[PDB]
């Protein structure tokens, strides 16, 4: 169970972190990234 | 090399040599790691299922 | 004869082999095993000078210095070096091809 | 039959000097004990071909073969590729105590060891027993008594 | 803020390489003082056998007396203890080794060290950190032995280390016989006779072969055991003199005792000593290695160290992490930019990755595991999956 | 250079036995060297000590 735990727990947690928190963040990045490129040009 | 295949070949050779062994003599393999090479794999495959 | 001198040099400087007290097979109840060595070689000029030879004509004992001179010289006397008209030693370095 | 220091001074250093220069060499080490045998190991980078490494090591050792003492040269230098651990242990035992340990070792060496080495995948077989031999245990007191 | 937390967590959390696993067997090594004979080693091996006989878990226990993975002699032994199947077994190999070490640390007269199978098949014979402490400035063997003794004491005082020991053959005493050549000449005894009698007293001489049931076997002549156990027997040897009266060796030999290292180990062309250790419970391999190097920093000048086996691979794995992460990020950046021919989209996809790193680090802190190679694989996988979610939207 | 050197060693290995005993004891040395001298390094005693 040691190897399985080591391989699994990190990916398990990182998956919830990438799902619950990204759905709200990546749109926020898209917003104001095009704003930054407008500011440059 | 492969531990499992080498262990199987060694065991087959020992079985072959048992026939010619004198009476009062006995073969043994007290320590072997080849048998553990398989069960672990099973677990992983089982987990996959 | 010179063969006698060579023989005496070989015998006096013999390089005795080492051993081990208590080595297997060992007697029952043996608890201590220890290596043992002996120095059968000569490590001084005077020791070689004092190597004993037996006279054939009379049987008397003589020393190596009696029929020889023992010194510390060089293995070979083939080459010499002169750096600017002065004695010295030197070696040459050859680079590997390529 | 020489102390570890003798072999270390005479043999090990000369071998390692040339051995140090092999391709894909992660490191190397040497060990000398009271048994009279010295073992120099060379560990190569992971993924390197064992066969190429062994032939390279053989080339480098034959490069430095000349300078070693005469007796060790007569005995010879053994170069081999092997794992660091035992795959298995094959044993012979007498349940009825009919055969002694020396007989068991002789039977193991004479017959079983060569057959096991014949099997594919068996890189090395290390035997912990010796074949039979004739032994003459001499009493020094009796020898000197007769002037021999 | 989340990116900063991810960076801090990745930086400061302990590290390891592989997780421990149970393979149903363990290995015990017995090392006894230099003067120990075969009987003394046999007694401790028999004590170990007796202590493991009652334990239900063990199914087989083979002991090899006279051979060890590090050094050979009459004071070294190695045993392989095999355990029953996991389900029938009611104990782990780690607890078995701990119990063996605790029990055999007082009763026996030598050091017994029970260890688990190596994490990887051919990366060593133990499960711990292996070190080579070497002399880089020609200090000498006695200086190296003093340094190893100091290091052993320092590691013993430390709590991060469970047991730190040295693998090899201990230093031992030796006897040298000095021959009075002048008295030999005075008594008429010829030196070659003394040399021959000394040489053949304690060695096996191979003479010739002889047929035994169709096989060639060696004829070996050696002195009887009873006459080669103590120095008195050696000094009792007699040689004829000029006057026809035997002279014993004791008359013309003086014994002198010294203390020298029996075994010589060398690593990377330098005199070296092999040391081993196992991290204590709740301590990682990286912590143990860091503490070991910090301790070595306190050792005298001219003494260096190098990591070998599993430790070196762990060092390489932990050095390369940042470069691999950066290259994976660059690869995904270029691939996304080429596919969608824009700069904003790939950068927006990159920014998410720290979010997945946050989850991974918090999960491995919550469960208490370490930053091993499997965690690195998981991190690089979460990179791709977070990029997969960011792409699916943007 | 290295390939030529190893080929020379392999080729001479066959002839080792045929040479007199003294030469075999002395051994045969195979090397790859330049025709001349890259440098000369020497030791001198200025005070004749």
Numbering used by the authors:
A (entry chain C): 987 to 1027
B (entry chain C): 297 to 345
C (entry chain A): 199 to 296
D (entry chain C): 51 to 198
E (entry chain C): 544 to 937
F (entry chain A): 100 to 148
Paper text:
In A. baumannii, the best-characterized multidrug efflux system is the prevalent Acinetobacter drug efflux ABC (AdeABC) tripartite system. This efflux system is capable of mediating resistance to a broad spectrum of clinically relevant antimicrobial agents, such as aminoglycosides, tetracyclines, macrolides, β-lactams, fluoroquinolones, chloramphenicol, and trimethoprim. The AdeABC locus consists of three tandemly linked genes encoding the AdeA periplasmic membrane fusion protein, the AdeB multidrug efflux pump, which is an inner membrane protein belonging to the hydrophobe-amphiphile efflux resistance-nodulation-cell division (HAE-RND) family of efflux transporters, and the AdeC outer membrane channel protein. Each subunit of AdeB contains 12 transmembrane helices (TM1 to TM12) and six periplasmic subdomains (PN1, PN2, PC1, PC2, DN, and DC).
Three distinct conformations of apo-AdeB (AdeB-I, AdeB-II, and AdeB-III) were captured in our cryo-EM data. Like AdeB-I, the three AdeB protomers of the second apo-AdeB structure, designated AdeB-II, present an extrusion conformation, where the three periplasmic clefts of the AdeB trimer are closed and a channel for extrusion is found in each protomer. However, in the AdeB-II structure, it is observed that the organization of the AdeB trimer is packed in a way that can be interpreted as a dimer plus monomer configuration within the transmembrane domain. The region that maintains the assembly of the pump in the trimeric oligomerization state is the periplasmic domain, where the long-arm feature formed by subdomain DN strongly coordinates with the hook-like structural feature of subdomain DC of the neighboring AdeB subunit to secure intersubunit interactions within the trimer. This region also contributes to form a hinge so that the transmembrane domain of each protomer is capable of shifting toward and away from each other. Within the two protomers interacting with each other at the transmembrane region, we observed three bound PE lipids. One of these lipids is located at the interface between the two AdeB protomers. The other two lipid molecules are found to bind by individual protomers. No lipid is observed to associate with the third AdeB protomer. We suspect that the switch in configuration of the trimeric AdeB pump from trimer to dimer plus monomer and monomer plus monomer plus monomer can alter the interactions between the AdeB pump and AdeA adaptor at the protein-protein interface, in turn facilitating the transport of substrates across the periplasmic space of A. baumannii.
